[PDB]
């Protein structure tokens, strides 16, 4: 959200994928969220699934490219 | 020497598109079979950002209106010869 604004780096969202992807730390650390996911699918799907809408909902524009890779995987 | 393979890369690369696209439980299979190849040629070769955006998975026309236009009014010699260079 203070990025998206606060930087000249940000079809479309393809090229965000790409340029987020692109980095280091952010990519590992969506590794780690992606990890406790697949840790957590069979366990509570509904939750989880709950939680992510609930925060795309209050946070649409930001995130959502987290959200398309985590769809595209699953 | 990578920068020589370019065209290669570029082949390979949408090859292994055409793969997860038609077939991904074979491709996946595959690409887990030869993970370490996959990750220390990413790491080396970092400047195949195609390589990377398929780390990150796991127009063309529109160009070519005005030589399409300049070839089909085209008259005399030079005009033909011009765009058919181009």
């Known amino acids: ?74 | 020497s990578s920068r020589h393979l370019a065209a290669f890369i570029n082949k390979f690369v949408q090859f292994i598109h055409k793969y997860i696209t038609y077939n991904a439980p074979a491709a996946i299979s595959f690409l887990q079979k030869h993970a370490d190849p996959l990750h220390d040629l990413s790491f080396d070769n970092s400047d195949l950002v195609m390589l990377k955006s398929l780390l990150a998975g796991l127009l063309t026309a529109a160009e070519m209106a005005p030589y399409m236009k300049r070839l089909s009014r085209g008259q005399t010699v030079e005009d033909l010869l011009e765009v058919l260079s181009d």
């Open chain 1, 1 to 74: 959200s203070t990025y998206s604004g606060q930087h000249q780096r940000v079809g479309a969202l393809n090229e965000l994928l790409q340029l987020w992807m692109g980095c280091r730390a952010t990519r590992t650390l969506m590794d780690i969220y992606v990890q406790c996911l697949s840790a957590l699918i069979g366990s509570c799907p509904d939750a989880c699934v709950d939680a992510l809408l609930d925060t795309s909902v209050q946070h649409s524009p930001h995130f959502d490219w987290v959200v398309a890779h985590i769809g595209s995987s699953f």
